[PDB]
Amino acid sequence: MQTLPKERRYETLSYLPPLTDVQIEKQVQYILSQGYIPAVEFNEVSEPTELYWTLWKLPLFGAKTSREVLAEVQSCRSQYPGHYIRVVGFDNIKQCQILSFIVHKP
């Protein structure tokens, strides 16, 4: 028997070990493949009550390859090191977010 340690969790893909930049590339490849619109979001503090983070630039409407979304990730990581950042995927037919996962911790 083992007792479960207390951990502060971060929505989808947080119970898996922290993601490698290759695992990052495969999950955004899935966003552009299904035809959804990938975007970058940042916030100072992470809490269950607040449901709007500060949007980074615009949703990248013209995204051909998954590398263009990775370069937008590293430029925000450089600008705000002490911020929470996550990448989302808007769908245009069903008017809802498909995917929401957290990439950098302060």
> By the criterion CB under 8 A, which residues form the site for another protein?
1-4, 6-17, 23, 26-27, 29-30, 33, 46-48, 51, 88, 94-101
* Minimum gap (Å) between residue 86 Cβ and another protein: 10
* Minimum gap (Å) between residue 90 Cβ and another protein: 11
Choose between 27 and 56: whose C-beta lies nearer to another protein.
Answer: 27
* Minimum gap (Å) between residue 78 Cβ and another protein: 26
Choose between 50 and 78: whose C-beta lies nearer to another protein.
Answer: 50
Q: What values do phi and psi take at 23, rounded to 5?
A: -60, -35
| C-alpha to C-alpha distance for 62 and 102, rounded to whole angstroms | 23
Choose between 79 and 97: whose C-beta lies nearer to another protein.
Answer: 97
CA distances 53 to 1, 14, 47, Å, are: 40, 18, 11
| C-alpha to C-alpha distance for 96 and 90, rounded to whole angstroms | 6
| C-alpha to C-alpha distance for 32 and 29, rounded to whole angstroms | 5
